[PDB]
Amino acid sequence: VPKWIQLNNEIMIQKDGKFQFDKDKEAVHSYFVDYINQNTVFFHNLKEKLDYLVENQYYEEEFLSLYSFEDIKEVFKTAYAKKFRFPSFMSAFKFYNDYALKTNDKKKILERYEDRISIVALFFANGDTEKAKEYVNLMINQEYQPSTPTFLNAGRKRRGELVSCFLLEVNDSLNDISRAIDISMQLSKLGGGVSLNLSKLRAKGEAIKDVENATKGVVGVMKLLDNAFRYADQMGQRQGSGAAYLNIFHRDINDFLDTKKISADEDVRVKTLSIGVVIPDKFVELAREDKAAYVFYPHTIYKEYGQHMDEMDMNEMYDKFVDNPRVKKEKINPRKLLEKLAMLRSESGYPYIMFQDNVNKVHANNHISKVKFSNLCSEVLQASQVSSYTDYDEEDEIGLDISCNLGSLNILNVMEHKSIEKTVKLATDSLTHVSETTDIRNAPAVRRANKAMKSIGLGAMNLHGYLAQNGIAYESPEARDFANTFFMMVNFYSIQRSAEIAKEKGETFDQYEGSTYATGEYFDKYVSTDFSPKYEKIANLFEGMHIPTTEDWKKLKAFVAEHGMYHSYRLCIAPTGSISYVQSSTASVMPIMERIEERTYGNSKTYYPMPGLASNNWFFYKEAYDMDMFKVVDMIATIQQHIDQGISFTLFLKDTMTTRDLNRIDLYAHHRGIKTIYYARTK
Amino acid sequence: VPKWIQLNNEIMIQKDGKFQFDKDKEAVHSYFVDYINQNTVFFHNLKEKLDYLVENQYYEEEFLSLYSFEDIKEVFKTAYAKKFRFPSFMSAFKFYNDYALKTNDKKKILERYEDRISIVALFFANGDTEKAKEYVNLMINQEYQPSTPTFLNAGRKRRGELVSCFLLEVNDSLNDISRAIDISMQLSKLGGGVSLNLSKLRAKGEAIKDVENATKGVVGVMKLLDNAFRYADQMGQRQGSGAAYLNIFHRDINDFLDTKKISADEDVRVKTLSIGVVIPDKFVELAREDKAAYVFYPHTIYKEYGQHMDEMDMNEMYDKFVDNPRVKKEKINPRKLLEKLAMLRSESGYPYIMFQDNVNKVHANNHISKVKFSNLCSEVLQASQVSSYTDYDEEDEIGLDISCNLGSLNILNVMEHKSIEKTVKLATDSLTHVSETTDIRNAPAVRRANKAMKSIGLGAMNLHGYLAQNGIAYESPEARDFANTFFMMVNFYSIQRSAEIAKEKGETFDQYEGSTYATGEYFDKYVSTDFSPKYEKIANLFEGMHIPTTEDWKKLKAFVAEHGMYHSYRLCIAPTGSISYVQSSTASVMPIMERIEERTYGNSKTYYPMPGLASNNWFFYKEAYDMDMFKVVDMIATIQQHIDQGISFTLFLKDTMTTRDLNRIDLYAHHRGIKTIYYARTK
Amino acid sequence: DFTQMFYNQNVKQFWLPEEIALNGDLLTWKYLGKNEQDTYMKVLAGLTLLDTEQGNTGMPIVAEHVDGHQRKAVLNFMAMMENAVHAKSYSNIFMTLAPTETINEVFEWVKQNKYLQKKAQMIVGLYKAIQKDDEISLFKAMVASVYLESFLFYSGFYYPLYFYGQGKLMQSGEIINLILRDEAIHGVYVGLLAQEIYNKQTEEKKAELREFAIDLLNQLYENELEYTEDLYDQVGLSHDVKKFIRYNANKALMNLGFDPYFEEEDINPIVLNGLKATVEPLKDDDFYF
Amino acid sequence: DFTQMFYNQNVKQFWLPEEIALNGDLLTWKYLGKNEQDTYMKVLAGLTLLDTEQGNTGMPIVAEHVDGHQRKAVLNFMAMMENAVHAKSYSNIFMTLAPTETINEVFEWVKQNKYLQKKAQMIVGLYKAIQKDDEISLFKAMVASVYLESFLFYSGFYYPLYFYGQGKLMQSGEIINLILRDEAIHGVYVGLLAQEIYNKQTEEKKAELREFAIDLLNQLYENELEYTEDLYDQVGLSHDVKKFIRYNANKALMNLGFDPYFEEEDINPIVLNGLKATVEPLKDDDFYF
Numbered sequence A, B: 001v002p003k004w005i006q007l008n009n010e011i012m013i014q015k016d017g018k019f020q021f022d023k024d025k026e027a028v029h030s031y032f033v034d035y036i037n038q039n040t041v042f043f044h045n046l047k048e049k050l051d052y053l054v055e056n057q058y059y060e061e062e063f064l065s066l067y068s069f070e071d072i073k074e075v076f077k078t079a080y081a082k083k084f085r086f087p088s089f090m091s092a093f094k095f096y097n098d099y100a101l102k103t104n105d106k107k108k109i110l111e112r113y114e115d116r117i118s119i120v121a122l123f124f125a126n127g128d129t130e131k132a133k134e135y136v137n138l139m140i141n142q143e144y145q146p147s148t149p150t151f152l153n154a155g156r157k158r159r160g161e162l163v164s165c166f167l168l169e170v171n172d173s174l175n176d177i178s179r180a181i182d183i184s185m186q187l188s189k190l191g192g193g194v195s196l197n198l199s200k201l202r203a204k205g206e207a208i209k210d211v212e213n214a215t216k217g218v219v220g221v222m223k224l225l226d227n228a229f230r231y232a233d234q235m236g237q238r239q240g241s242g243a244a245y246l247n248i249f250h251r252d253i254n255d256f257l258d259t260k261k262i263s264a265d266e267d268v269r270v271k272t273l274s275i276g277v278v279i280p281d282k283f284v285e286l287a288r289e290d291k292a293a294y295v296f297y298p299h300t301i302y303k304e305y306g307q308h309m310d311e312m313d314m315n316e317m318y319d320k321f322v323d324n325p326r327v328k329k330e331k332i333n334p335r336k337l338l339e340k341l342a343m344l345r346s347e348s349g350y351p352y353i354m355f356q357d358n359v360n361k362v363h364a365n366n367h368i369s370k371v372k373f374s375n376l377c378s379e380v381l382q383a384s385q386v387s388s389y390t391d392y393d394e395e396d397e398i399g400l401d402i403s404c405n406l407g408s409l410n411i412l413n414v415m416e417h418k419s420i421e422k423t424v425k426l427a428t429d430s431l432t433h434v435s436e437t438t439d440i441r442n443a444p445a446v447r448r449a450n451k452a453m454k455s456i457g458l459g460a461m462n463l464h465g466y467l468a469q470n471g472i473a474y475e476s477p478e479a480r481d482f483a484n485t486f487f488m489m490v491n492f493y494s495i496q497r498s499a500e501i502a503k504e505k506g507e508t509f510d511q512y513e514g515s516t517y518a519t520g521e522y523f524d525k526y527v528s529t530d531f532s533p534k535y536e537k538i539a540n541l542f543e544g545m546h547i548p549t550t551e552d553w554k555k556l557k558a559f560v561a562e563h564g565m566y567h568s569y570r571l572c573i574a575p576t577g578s579i580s581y582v583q584s585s586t587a588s589v590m591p592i593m594e595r596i597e598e599r600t601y602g603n604s605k606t607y608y609p610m611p612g613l614a615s616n617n618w619f620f621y622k623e624a625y626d627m628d629m630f631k632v633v634d635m636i637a638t639i640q641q642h643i644d645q646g647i648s649f650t651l652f653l654k655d656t657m658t659t660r661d662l663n664r665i666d667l668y669a670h671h672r673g674i675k676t677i678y679y680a681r682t683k
Numbered sequence C, D: 001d002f003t004q005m006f007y008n009q010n011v012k013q014f015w016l017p018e019e020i021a022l023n024g025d026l027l028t029w030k031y032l033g034k035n036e037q038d039t040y041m042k043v044l045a046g047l048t049l050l051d052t053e054q055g056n057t058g059m060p061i062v063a064e065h066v067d068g069h070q071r072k073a074v075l076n077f078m079a080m081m082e083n084a085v086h087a088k089s090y091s092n093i094f095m096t097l098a099p100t101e102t103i104n105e106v107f108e109w110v111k112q113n114k115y116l117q118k119k120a121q122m123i124v125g126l127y128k129a130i131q132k133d134d135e136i137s138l139f140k141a142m143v144a145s146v147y148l149e150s151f152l153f154y155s156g157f158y159y160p161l162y163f164y165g166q167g168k169l170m171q172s173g174e175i176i177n178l179i180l181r182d183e184a185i186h187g188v189y190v191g192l193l194a195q196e197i198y199n200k201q202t203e204e205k206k207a208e209l210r211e212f213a214i215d216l217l218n219q220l221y222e223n224e225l226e227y228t229e230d231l232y233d234q235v236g237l238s239h240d241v242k243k244f245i246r247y248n249a250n251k252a253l254m255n256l257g258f259d260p261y262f263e264e265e266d267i268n269p270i271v272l273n274g275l276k277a278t279v280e281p282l283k284d285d286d287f288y289f
């Protein structure tokens, strides 16, 4: 066993009844003085390194050609001047195993952390040396972390796409289904997770040109998509991951759910395609009143009204659907469907739950389209227009397929540096650059939506780490007050940066004029309610930083009205799974699953303590499963009120609790304004 | 139990030690006195019937509008003047259960046999009343039978395409694979059987964008195609049928074959995807000499030579591939592979066997392309060019995808009417009309090849029926003499009609000038070898009909040289599954499987004796399983020497014979010039 | 003279309950009265208990004490059938026809039923009394096993056969017939082994062994009567079942080489109605013609 | 968490000796040298002798002491495969390749062989030492069983796999591959039963059981090296066989939830070529907060 492995395992060997957390630090030293420094490839100077990486097809030469070598040297020197040290063994291990650039045979390390950060910063700046240094300082301080696709692939020749998630709308036609399968394979080839809205597809037993009971429903398309994602599995490196979203009022909703039952037959079971359910407020109202609900056949509704079932408001059209004899429907028990959802989530963690009305009551771009589904991580909530892929030799009507670039603020590092504004603006600029340089030649709706919406996702990580390292319980009202203030600041500065980009470029996102940003409605709660901290401890935490007031929000509203906004969507809180290790941060705004996690790598086992875990903050690092899910819902709703897109909200459940407890948590989330629920992980 | 079913089951009841075959005739009468006439919709006049069928979206207005009502009435009167009577119960049952037009509620019969024949004739003639009457006389004499798609769908508004055999070339790319899946779905939606060539696809463990061990091979593509064919199942009417062809020198050939093993796992086995193997002469030579063979990685060959492995002659390329270090290959035992093929055919009848050099040594259009694969029934053998389907908003390079037009001569009815020439020419004209009226807007290469090649398949059936009713054993040399003469006359008149159509329209098929028809090579064996019958009995059978001599063939060769040939391909012998029942004929040129076949429809049993079966010809109606497969191979080769495309050749084996016997039959078929082997049906 | 043919017969009879689809019985089950369903569940539960102990204990312990690798192979195979095939098949039937609570209740009912506990106590007691190298204790356990195979199962088998014979519950009935076909050969085989031991004894010892066998049969019989009445009175069939178990008791005695003990009676006629290809390598001469 | 899954995998792997025709092996057997034929015979007899112990004692003794009806059924099925399928398969291979007198002599030799006896008696000793209601002694026997199934057989399996990977003795090699596939799952299953016992122990007791397992492995491994040289030096294969033993020792340890003992090595490519939360209804007022 390696020396650093033994040093890391020495953490759990208690001394005087206490964990040896400091041993972890020793491990990193070993991991660098025995493995990383020996396995790294050193050159005489930076010129030889850059030339070797360029000619050997490791780096794209275009982004490096925008800078003179003196500027690149200055950027690299700025990166190395911080003398960044990984405080935990797992941070360095995760970076050098998942994100550091290696040779073709993967026998040596070509990129250090500073090298990777410098390359990403130079790609972000697009020829601006000062901007590149700003990005270097932002990432080496670990205030901002680009998503895994962006951080791993920026400036690389053998790179994939920098966009993490893609959302596709599938129209009810064989041509559209085949095009959706093709685009899903193309985007999984690019490495991104693909989500498909199957609510427009007509249910099982519908007519294909006057021959009835002909359609296979959404389950056949689900099987096709599952095989497509199995085939396109990132060249066999990462399993192809897809998501299917169906409205709960679709007739196939049961069969949909039956794809995830552990007793499902092979002709129905789907195993590589995640499932999500979109629940309008009408379904929750029907379940609450115990009135029997009706699921609908989409094609009959489309024939009668000319629009898809998910294209209009069910809260106002459900009674018209039910009373219409030309609309076909089936009777269901909404409470039984809710119990089935809870049982399925207990068994397998599926489906994702999207509260459609919670998303669309604060959605700023309802004029473009209502949000009808979410992404594979159930945090992207954007307007999408379905595409009409016609026959060959016929022009296709290209719609809008959602796609946003992810980037997370490290809350602990951002607040320690007292740089919410600067970090938010620089992250917005980096995400705007990632969107601008993204061009996908096989997904036309994705390309058009990227060019028009200009949507980005600016997330946050290390919420629980910051709260526990500052002596604040994650479930406490003080923690929710901190989240309210911090994310109001993040939203304020993201809107300010979006408006500044719109002013400097003279262009807004497409159809911005009909948005609530243009009409000023979006700023209502910000121009009437003060989001400054209500607790003295939180206010002290925010000292040295100008917390925006109602007057600052009014000025920002006027600025947006004058100049517009460059981005249709700005903030989305992704799960941030593996890149949180490198940043020494807790995953996303979720509470920690465990204080010390035991992970098996190779034939060895390693223990990763939570960042900053110690004796004095052991009980502030409360495990998520031990927490009240209602207070976690309160925290997520408090954050969500300042996030325009959704938050990947994983439910952490105990084995003792029943499906009724899961249903109660889901209904409280819906009541509190939670937009989406990601996972039901049971301990 | 209905009266006609009792009269049909009375056949097996033996009187005086003989089957009551004549009772079947009585059954037909009952089937018409009790059921057909009662459930047949009658109109006051044909005008009312045509108006009702057109208005209720049963027929098409376009083809009926080309004639005055007097001409349509005259065509119907010509059809009804024959007073055609089905000689067996199963003929009428199959027609009125499969082909007769029924109401939307499927309880009444709108079309009789004469009505359907008249409608198909009017569709064929395209406005010529005399030509329509000629077609009516052809089909009511049952000399020619349009295929199930053409016969069932001609003149019907609610219909699939008139072509059901489609051959697709799949290029080695994700875009091409997705396009192939889409086209397969679209053609299965039209009701056609789709065959895909997977030899150009790179094997498992190949590089994608210079990353190693990334390709899933052809088995993942087969899984995708199997899912696509399961999804597209004729609006839930018939099981989606598809075929995949792989060259035996493709490295995936074992895994390909492993998709049909019973022991194969769920992630390996494809259930609705037929498989065929293309066997070049090089593989047979390697197996014969017991030299170990090599299966090659197609992408390495493409990188080294710039052409696909299946696009070049393996006979001259195999040694260069083996000696090339940059071509990756795996060692195999060709005799072990042959034994595996025989074992798989014994277990499941798969794969289909295509002898590439047997096809291509007589292929007339090798300049366009060599025949690389066959159809789902393993009888279509045509030149195909792969298409380069690029990314979106980029122009695709459309190639040639095979789609031939099926139609079968009834050898008994044709020869008893002494009308080989007239029937062949009229069938060629009808096939040309159906090929010209076919327009598929979702298969670009299929449409392009249909427009360019103008390839049709004119088959024959009732060969064994005709031979048995004339006191000739199917395995006798007299039967092979008759087949030689009859199919040489069929080829002569098909070529003459093709040249006449080319002269009339002033156009040949695309790239005809490079064909062996243009150079006169095709006629070589016809201008030197006399194909007149060598037996007096066969000559007396051909009495009253002019048998083309060598001088006639020289005149035809000169005529083709002067005027060209309209069809790239003219003759292919399809299995003729259900139309053989309606025509009261034995299926294809195959020998009969059973003298009397027992079938179960609903909860009732039915008995179909072979047409013309009696005590006198009971011995001549020898069952296929009791026959020597070498003599069946000899007869099929005798026919194949006059057929430009292949013949659906099913092997009929006993359970006693082993895989050595199957391999011996396959090798004798290869030796005798058999182009394709369809199935290995074990009794 | 017989083990090899029993080996071949046992292995050729191999089956799994999953070979039989059970959803076809759903309607004829739904249509039975509550009394009929109750008796049916309990009957199969009693059978499950017997096979559980025959598989866990009876067959393995007899296998341990019987000499000869082939005899042991037959007995091991029979043991596997008892618990891996027979006992499990009943759960397949239960899981198809009954809700979980009814299944839970019937297994609780076997634990507390005094006749089922008594018969298990008696049979398993004899199995566990076998002493190494003591042929008499082994004989006694083999008699107990024959009585389980050829007599005790039959109060249970009656009811599935009674339905099968009326064209009811025919898929479940198919499973039961396969189980019965197995037990018939198991009873014969163990009977032949018991006779081997009996035939080694003095006439005086034989007389004692017959006394043991008849006393044991009577004791089991009297208990089975009470069990039969307890289960079948609610469906009106107790007297009919009693005739059936006496019939099968005689078959068990015959399997042991003893004369029938009960007089012949007419059994319900309904219940009587309830009863790759070869590969050769390619020669170089097969490539030339 | 695992018994029903293993039940399924076991029963779906069921096979019989008669399925593979053996006579065609004589066409490659006749071309082997005397040393090759000698090694093959000796290896085959070694496997046969060890597998008989597993069928007569190893599996039945574990089935006897393990609690749980479903586990007893799976274990019974495995014992059946040893006695009814594997033992007949080994006999069939022998009878095909050697005359009766040669078979008797090879078994006499291997029966007296020091290295075969050492390992056979070490394993049997641990099975004989199991005490009623003592889970420690049961665990030790399970370790012995896993070592036999997943480790000790492999010095023997090497040779048939070596021929099988070369196109020699393909019929008997197919049989051996089916046997080996059964022993693999047997080893994994018994391994899970051992881990269950291990996980019920204190930390000191665990460390003591680990020391037992490693000490036993060491004794068996050192004897395997001697066994290997004794059989394989005459055909020049011992170096590669030793790599195969260590690789399989590591698999056996992993089956017992332990870390690999030996460094990772590549294997001979010819041999490689041969190889539910509680459902509670919503009660209303759960929709109001």
Ligand SMILES: Nc1ncnc2c1ncn2[C@@H]1O[C@H](COP(=O)(O)OP(=O)(O)OP(=O)(O)O)[C@@H](O)[C@H]1O
Pocket: A028, A029, A032, A033, A037, A084, A085, A086, A087, A092
């Ligand atoms: N935790 C760590 N994170 C990142 N790099 C590290 C870490 N530990 C060691 N290294 C790398 O290994 C080298 C070993 O040097 P070390 O940290 O022991 O101190 P040093 O030799 O006094 O110099 P310096 O600390 O100034 O780099 C470091 O210079 C650095 O490049």
Ligand SMILES: Nc1ncnc2c1ncn2[C@@H]1O[C@H](COP(=O)(O)OP(=O)(O)OP(=O)(O)O)[C@@H](O)[C@H]1O
Pocket: B028, B029, B032, B033, B037, B084, B085, B086, B087, B092
């Ligand atoms: N074998 C048969 N094949 C086809 N149609 C038949 C057959 N037998 C009877 N029919 C149908 O039933 C009708 C009655 O025929 P039948 O044998 O009674 O005498 P017919 O002289 O042909 O009668 P019709 O006056 O109808 O022409 C036929 O006209 C035809 O429509």
Ligand SMILES: Cc1cn([C@H]2C[C@H](O)[C@@H](COP(=O)(O)OP(=O)(O)OP(=O)(O)O)O2)c(=O)[nH]c1=O
Pocket: A171, A172, A173, A174, A175, A177, A201, A202, A207, A208, A209, A210, A214, A215, A216, A217, A220, B189, B231, B232, B233, B234, B235, B236
């Ligand atoms: C062709 C086909 C379609 N479908 C379903 C899936 C599609 O969502 C739906 C629409 O198919 P379409 O491609 O729209 O078929 P169509 O346009 O010819 O029929 P229509 O005019 O009624 O639109 O039909 C199947 O389930 N199986 C099939 O094989």
Ligand SMILES: [Mg+2]
Pocket: A172, A173, A174
């Ligand atoms: Mg449509």
Ligand SMILES: [Mg+2]
Pocket: B172, B173, B174
């Ligand atoms: Mg390519």
Ligand SMILES: [Mn+2]
Pocket: C051, C054, C081, C082, C086, C087, C179, C182, C183
């Ligand atoms: Mn039993």
Ligand SMILES: [Mn+2]
Pocket: C054, C078, C082, C149, C182, C183, C186, C187
């Ligand atoms: Mn039994």
Ligand SMILES: [Mn+2]
Pocket: D051, D054, D081, D082, D086, D179, D183
């Ligand atoms: Mn064994």
Ligand SMILES: [Mn+2]
Pocket: D054, D082, D149, D182, D183, D186
């Ligand atoms: Mn074993």
